[PDB]
Design a protein around this motif. Structure first.
Motif, PDB file in Angstrom:
ATOM      1  N   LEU A 154       0.800  -1.220   0.000  1.00  0.00           N
ATOM      2  CA  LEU A 154       0.000   0.000   0.000  1.00  0.00           C
ATOM      3  C   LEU A 154       0.838   1.277   0.000  1.00  0.00           C
ATOM      4  CD1 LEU A 154      -2.779  -0.927   2.601  1.00  0.00           C
ATOM      5  CD2 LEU A 154      -3.132  -0.579   0.146  1.00  0.00           C
ATOM      6  N   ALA A 155       1.879   1.307   0.830  1.00  0.00           N
ATOM      7  CA  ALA A 155       2.738   2.482   0.933  1.00  0.00           C
ATOM      8  C   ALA A 155       3.393   2.874  -0.384  1.00  0.00           C
ATOM      9  CB  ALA A 155       3.810   2.257   2.005  1.00  0.00           C
ATOM     10  N   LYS A 156       3.622   1.899  -1.258  1.00  0.00           N
ATOM     11  CA  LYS A 156       4.247   2.183  -2.544  1.00  0.00           C
ATOM     12  C   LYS A 156       3.428   3.144  -3.402  1.00  0.00           C
ATOM     13  CE  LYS A 156       7.155  -1.910  -3.359  1.00  0.00           C
ATOM     14  NZ  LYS A 156       7.066  -2.566  -2.027  1.00  0.00           N
ATOM     15  N   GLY A 157       2.108   3.116  -3.240  1.00  0.00           N
ATOM     16  CA  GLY A 157       1.256   4.002  -4.013  1.00  0.00           C
ATOM     17  C   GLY A 157       1.321   3.746  -5.508  1.00  0.00           C
ATOM     18  N   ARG A 158       1.370   2.474  -5.889  1.00  0.00           N
ATOM     19  CA  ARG A 158       1.431   2.094  -7.298  1.00  0.00           C
ATOM     20  C   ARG A 158       0.101   1.505  -7.759  1.00  0.00           C
ATOM     21  NH1 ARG A 158       6.320  -1.713  -8.808  1.00  0.00           N
ATOM     22  NH2 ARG A 158       5.570  -2.869  -6.976  1.00  0.00           N
ATOM     23  N   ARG A 159      -0.973   1.895  -7.084  1.00  0.00           N
ATOM     24  CA  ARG A 159      -2.307   1.411  -7.409  1.00  0.00           C
ATOM     25  C   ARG A 159      -2.691   1.836  -8.826  1.00  0.00           C
ATOM     26  NH1 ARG A 159      -6.132  -0.397  -4.432  1.00  0.00           N
ATOM     27  NH2 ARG A 159      -5.465   0.365  -2.377  1.00  0.00           N
ATOM     28  N   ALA A 160      -3.337   0.937  -9.565  1.00  0.00           N
ATOM     29  CA  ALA A 160      -3.756   1.247 -10.925  1.00  0.00           C
ATOM     30  C   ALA A 160      -4.684   2.457 -10.904  1.00  0.00           C
ATOM     31  CB  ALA A 160      -4.467   0.049 -11.543  1.00  0.00           C
ATOM     32  N   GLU A 161      -4.723   3.197 -12.009  1.00  0.00           N
ATOM     33  CA  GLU A 161      -5.571   4.383 -12.107  1.00  0.00           C
ATOM     34  C   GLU A 161      -6.366   4.302 -13.448  1.00  0.00           C
ATOM     35  OE1 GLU A 161      -2.305   7.218  -9.705  1.00  0.00           O
ATOM     36  OE2 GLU A 161      -3.195   7.836 -11.617  1.00  0.00           O
ATOM     37  N   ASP A 162      -6.799   3.059 -13.860  1.00  0.00           N
ATOM     38  CA  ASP A 162      -7.610   2.775 -15.048  1.00  0.00           C
ATOM     39  C   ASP A 162      -8.754   3.820 -14.999  1.00  0.00           C
ATOM     40  OD1 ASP A 162      -6.824  -0.288 -16.459  1.00  0.00           O
ATOM     41  OD2 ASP A 162      -6.227  -0.047 -14.351  1.00  0.00           O
ATOM     42  N   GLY A 163      -8.370   4.972 -15.561  1.00  0.00           N
ATOM     43  CA  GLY A 163      -8.984   6.299 -15.759  1.00  0.00           C
ATOM     44  C   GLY A 163     -10.450   6.370 -15.474  1.00  0.00           C
ATOM     45  N   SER A 164     -11.176   5.743 -16.277  1.00  0.00           N
ATOM     46  CA  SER A 164     -12.535   5.755 -16.000  1.00  0.00           C
ATOM     47  C   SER A 164     -13.116   4.604 -16.749  1.00  0.00           C
ATOM     48  CB  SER A 164     -13.174   7.080 -16.406  1.00  0.00           C
ATOM     49  OG  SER A 164     -12.656   8.151 -15.642  1.00  0.00           O
ATOM     50  N   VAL A 165     -12.236   3.809 -17.347  1.00  0.00           N
ATOM     51  CA  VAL A 165     -12.662   2.680 -18.159  1.00  0.00           C
ATOM     52  C   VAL A 165     -13.053   1.510 -17.273  1.00  0.00           C
ATOM     53  CG1 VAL A 165     -12.049   1.077 -19.976  1.00  0.00           C
ATOM     54  CG2 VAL A 165     -11.096   3.391 -19.976  1.00  0.00           C
ATOM     55  N   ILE A 166     -14.351   1.234 -17.223  1.00  0.00           N
ATOM     56  CA  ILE A 166     -14.860   0.143 -16.410  1.00  0.00           C
ATOM     57  C   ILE A 166     -14.592  -1.190 -17.093  1.00  0.00           C
ATOM     58  CG2 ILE A 166     -16.888  -0.853 -15.313  1.00  0.00           C
ATOM     59  CD1 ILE A 166     -18.097   1.920 -15.190  1.00  0.00           C
ATOM     60  N   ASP A 167     -13.958  -2.101 -16.360  1.00  0.00           N
ATOM     61  CA  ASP A 167     -13.630  -3.430 -16.863  1.00  0.00           C
ATOM     62  C   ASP A 167     -14.513  -4.438 -16.144  1.00  0.00           C
ATOM     63  OD1 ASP A 167     -10.484  -5.301 -17.261  1.00  0.00           O
ATOM     64  OD2 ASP A 167     -12.574  -5.840 -17.695  1.00  0.00           O
ATOM     65  N   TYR A 168     -15.718  -4.620 -16.677  1.00  0.00           N
ATOM     66  CA  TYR A 168     -16.696  -5.527 -16.095  1.00  0.00           C
ATOM     67  C   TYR A 168     -16.203  -6.957 -15.949  1.00  0.00           C
ATOM     68  CZ  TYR A 168     -20.013  -1.693 -16.707  1.00  0.00           C
ATOM     69  OH  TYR A 168     -20.674  -0.486 -16.639  1.00  0.00           O
ATOM     70  N   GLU A 169     -15.429  -7.445 -16.915  1.00  0.00           N
ATOM     71  CA  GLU A 169     -14.936  -8.808 -16.822  1.00  0.00           C
ATOM     72  C   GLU A 169     -13.946  -8.963 -15.674  1.00  0.00           C
ATOM     73  OE1 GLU A 169     -12.452 -12.084 -19.501  1.00  0.00           O
ATOM     74  OE2 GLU A 169     -14.028 -10.843 -20.396  1.00  0.00           O
ATOM     75  N   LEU A 170     -13.069  -7.978 -15.497  1.00  0.00           N
ATOM     76  CA  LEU A 170     -12.085  -8.032 -14.420  1.00  0.00           C
ATOM     77  C   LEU A 170     -12.786  -7.848 -13.070  1.00  0.00           C
ATOM     78  CD1 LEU A 170      -9.084  -8.261 -13.683  1.00  0.00           C
ATOM     79  CD2 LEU A 170      -8.927  -5.776 -13.926  1.00  0.00           C
ATOM     80  N   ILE A 171     -13.841  -7.039 -13.057  1.00  0.00           N
ATOM     81  CA  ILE A 171     -14.608  -6.816 -11.834  1.00  0.00           C
ATOM     82  C   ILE A 171     -15.125  -8.172 -11.359  1.00  0.00           C
ATOM     83  CG2 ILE A 171     -16.795  -5.934 -10.928  1.00  0.00           C
ATOM     84  CD1 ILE A 171     -16.349  -3.450 -12.729  1.00  0.00           C
ATOM     85  N   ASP A 172     -15.716  -8.927 -12.280  1.00  0.00           N
ATOM     86  CA  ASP A 172     -16.251 -10.240 -11.944  1.00  0.00           C
ATOM     87  C   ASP A 172     -15.167 -11.246 -11.544  1.00  0.00           C
ATOM     88  OD1 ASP A 172     -18.569 -12.287 -12.084  1.00  0.00           O
ATOM     89  OD2 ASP A 172     -17.044 -13.127 -13.437  1.00  0.00           O
ATOM     90  N   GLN A 173     -14.070 -11.291 -12.295  1.00  0.00           N
ATOM     91  CA  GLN A 173     -13.002 -12.232 -11.990  1.00  0.00           C
ATOM     92  C   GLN A 173     -12.374 -11.947 -10.634  1.00  0.00           C
ATOM     93  OE1 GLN A 173     -12.289 -15.029 -13.854  1.00  0.00           O
ATOM     94  NE2 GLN A 173     -11.195 -15.520 -11.952  1.00  0.00           N
ATOM     95  N   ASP A 174     -12.186 -10.666 -10.331  1.00  0.00           N
ATOM     96  CA  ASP A 174     -11.611 -10.274  -9.051  1.00  0.00           C
ATOM     97  C   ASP A 174     -12.538 -10.683  -7.913  1.00  0.00           C
ATOM     98  OD1 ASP A 174      -9.905  -7.141  -9.936  1.00  0.00           O
ATOM     99  OD2 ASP A 174      -9.220  -9.226  -9.942  1.00  0.00           O
ATOM    100  N   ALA A 175     -13.840 -10.516  -8.117  1.00  0.00           N
ATOM    101  CA  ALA A 175     -14.804 -10.888  -7.087  1.00  0.00           C
ATOM    102  C   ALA A 175     -14.725 -12.392  -6.849  1.00  0.00           C
ATOM    103  CB  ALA A 175     -16.210 -10.487  -7.510  1.00  0.00           C
ATOM    104  N   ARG A 176     -14.680 -13.165  -7.932  1.00  0.00           N
ATOM    105  CA  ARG A 176     -14.593 -14.614  -7.807  1.00  0.00           C
ATOM    106  C   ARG A 176     -13.305 -15.031  -7.107  1.00  0.00           C
ATOM    107  NH1 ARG A 176     -17.856 -17.627 -11.159  1.00  0.00           N
ATOM    108  NH2 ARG A 176     -16.302 -19.315 -11.145  1.00  0.00           N
ATOM    109  N   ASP A 177     -12.199 -14.382  -7.464  1.00  0.00           N
ATOM    110  CA  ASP A 177     -10.907 -14.697  -6.870  1.00  0.00           C
ATOM    111  C   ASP A 177     -10.872 -14.376  -5.376  1.00  0.00           C
ATOM    112  OD1 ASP A 177      -8.719 -13.875  -9.729  1.00  0.00           O
ATOM    113  OD2 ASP A 177     -10.163 -15.486  -9.388  1.00  0.00           O
ATOM    114  N   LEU A 178     -11.497 -13.274  -4.972  1.00  0.00           N
ATOM    115  CA  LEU A 178     -11.518 -12.908  -3.555  1.00  0.00           C
ATOM    116  C   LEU A 178     -12.299 -13.951  -2.760  1.00  0.00           C
ATOM    117  CD1 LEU A 178     -12.176  -9.052  -3.671  1.00  0.00           C
ATOM    118  CD2 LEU A 178     -10.047 -10.227  -3.120  1.00  0.00           C
ATOM    119  N   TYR A 179     -13.353 -14.472  -3.378  1.00  0.00           N
ATOM    120  CA  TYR A 179     -14.192 -15.487  -2.755  1.00  0.00           C
ATOM    121  C   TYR A 179     -13.462 -16.827  -2.668  1.00  0.00           C
ATOM    122  CZ  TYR A 179     -18.137 -18.695  -2.047  1.00  0.00           C
ATOM    123  OH  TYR A 179     -18.991 -19.666  -1.573  1.00  0.00           O
ATOM    124  N   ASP A 180     -12.865 -17.258  -3.777  1.00  0.00           N
ATOM    125  CA  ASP A 180     -12.141 -18.530  -3.801  1.00  0.00           C
ATOM    126  C   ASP A 180     -10.948 -18.506  -2.849  1.00  0.00           C
ATOM    127  OD1 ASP A 180     -13.897 -19.133  -5.878  1.00  0.00           O
ATOM    128  OD2 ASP A 180     -12.405 -18.770  -7.446  1.00  0.00           O
TER     129      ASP A 180
END
Length: 319
Positions: A154-180
């Motif tokens: 977190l301290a590194k501050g290298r978090r992505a800044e995908d401007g405003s482009v919503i990535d619905y597929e990644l949103i879903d995959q990330d949700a599944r990965d957090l659950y698994d």
């Protein structure tokens, strides 16, 4: 300038005028704390720097040092905090959190979990200039295990800044990965949680945590309480709150600092000083929505004297 800050740039600004008036206030028998507070809490951070410059040129004394000598107690803490630039203040607060044998994990977490990439970039730079060592190195030496991994990431501050482009597929995959990686099985794949929660943008993660409710029986916060413990759990809980609703996060921290007997001034002061020109108006709105009475009211009923007056000015009123 942030439209959501409570402290705005003073319009009829004259650094010389303020420096002259503060000097007179400092030299008044017993100090005129009222004037010092009235001026500094009604000027933007940048303007305060201009005042400090004008003060030294005229008196041959640094304003900060003059005030450390003139003021004391909680008031001194508020005033000196307001004189530091945002990055400098955060850097010093972080350094203070890791001072001595122990570590003020709560403060370290609050700061590291709430600052943006932009703010962290500056903090890292200023931290290196002020204490000569890197922020990451200090975190590494004051923490361990997965908690260290998460905080360093977190301290590194290298978090992505995908401007405003919503990535619905990644949103879903990330949700599944957090659950698994958690509630779905025995144990927890903490590295996966750290990667996803530290590498994706905030807007993305807000959407991920929402999509996560479609796969998991409990929301993200409850999932965290069931999967991890200790400082690691505390860090994740703070981080998710900051992602979901940062203004509310600060409002809760503020309420917690004043709820019981006396007040946890360390936290109260840091938030009022550091968020005064960022999102204090949003914090106030969330605070009132949840607690009923205004933040101003709680500050008023929980602190006293010139200290209270200073904090009330940073609050800015209520509405």
């Amino acid at each position: 300038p942030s439209a959501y800050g409570s402290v705005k740039a003073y319009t009829n600004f004259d650094a010389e005028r303020d420096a002259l008036n503060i000097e007179t206030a400092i030299k008044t028998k017993g100090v005129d704390e009222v004037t010092i507070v009235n001026i500094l809490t009604n000027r933007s951070n940048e303007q305060r720097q201009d005042i400090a410059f004008a003060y030294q040129r005229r008196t041959k004394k640094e304003l900060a040092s003059a005030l450390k000598s003139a003021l004391s107690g909680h008031l001194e803490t508020v005033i000196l905090g307001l004189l530091k630039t945002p990055a400098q203040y955060d850097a010093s607060e972080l350094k203070a959190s890791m001072k001595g044998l122990g570590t003020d994990e709560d403060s370290l977490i609050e700061i590291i979990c709430s600052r943006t990439n932009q703010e962290l970039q500056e903090i890292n730079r200023v931290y290196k200039e002020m204490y000569k060592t890197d922020l990451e190195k200090d975190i590494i030496s004051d923490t361990s295990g997965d908690f260290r991994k998460l905080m360093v990431a977190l301290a590194k501050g290298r978090r992505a800044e995908d401007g405003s482009v919503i990535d619905y597929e990644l949103i879903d995959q990330d949700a599944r990965d957090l659950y698994d990686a958690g509630v779905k099985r025995k144990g927890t794949d903490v590295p996966k949680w750290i990667s996803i929660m530290t590498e994706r943008s905030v807007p993305h993660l807000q959407k991920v945590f929402d999509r996560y409710k479609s796969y998991s029986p409990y929301d993200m916060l409850e999932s965290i309480r069931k999967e991890v413990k200790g400082d690691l759990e505390n860090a994740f809980l703070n981080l998710v709150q900051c992602i979901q609703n940062k203004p509310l996060y600060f409002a809760d921290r503020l309420y917690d600092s004043m709820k019981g007997k006396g007040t946890r001034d360390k936290v109260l002061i840091r938030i009022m000083v550091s968020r005064s020109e960022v999102d204090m108006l949003k914090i106030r709105s969330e605070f009132k929505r949840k607690y009923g009475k205004s933040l101003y009211y709680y500050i008023q009923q929980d602190t006293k004297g010139d200290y209270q007056k200073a904090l009330l000015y940073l609050c800015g009123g209520d509405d």
